[PDB]
């Protein structure tokens, strides 16, 4: 099981302890999705930043490449070269 955590809010008005926690967690920019294997340690860290973050549990995690592939929009065309 994995927490899919997302940095919903910015770190602009945020104090330095909370910024440091966010950095440790692994979230860079706003809306930067990160999957974390569930444990007590990561849960407590997420609780410490509960108002900046959106968490949701998952069966499986996704690698960055998989996430990118999921994101990619449908090109509404099929090329045929001649």
């Amino acid at each position: 099981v994995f927490y899919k955590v997302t940095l919903s809010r910015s770190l602009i008005g945020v104090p330095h302890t909370t910024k440091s926690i966010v950095k440790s967690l692994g979230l860079g920019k706003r809306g930067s999705i990160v999957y974390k294997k569930v444990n007590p340690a990561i849960a407590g860290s997420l609780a410490k930043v509960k108002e900046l973050v959106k968490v949701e549990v998952t069966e499986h995690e996704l690698t960055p490449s998989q996430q990118r592939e999921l994101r990619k929009s449908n090109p509404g065309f099929i090329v045929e070269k001649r």
Partner: protein
């Protein structure tokens, strides 16, 4: 006070709805954290994900902060909370010993659910 920080003493309807939504989101986050921990503990014992989700007896979190957050006396939910504590902080130097939450700096990030028992 020649410089004009034109901030109204009370919130609009739309502001209040947003505040409520934010409060609900933090409760949801907490719920997700507890749920994931429970699922993990079920897996450790030796159940599948689906089986863990089904389980009648949900495991309560052992770590302290999480356990406190779960308690409504310490950290109440938005549905539990009073109208007043959603939209008014305790401020000892204000008249009424009360102040709009919107007047708190970084109120959109910073959480503040529980006021004192009689203030």
């Amino acid at each position: 006070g020649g410089l004009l920080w034109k901030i109204p003493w009370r919130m609009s309807t739309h502001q209040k709805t947003r505040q409520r939504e934010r409060l609900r989101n933090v409760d949801q986050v907490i719920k997700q954290l507890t749920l994931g921990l429970h699922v993990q503990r079920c897996q450790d014992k030796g159940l599948t994900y689906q089986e863990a989700m089904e389980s009648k007896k949900k495991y309560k979190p052992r770590s302290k902060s999480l356990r406190l957050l779960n308690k409504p006396s310490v950290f109440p939910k938005e549905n539990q909370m009073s109208s007043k504590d959603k939209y008014w902080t305790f401020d000892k130097k204000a008249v009424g010993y009360r102040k709009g939450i919107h007047k708190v700096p970084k109120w959109t990030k910073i959480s503040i659910r529980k006021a004192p028992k009689f203030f």
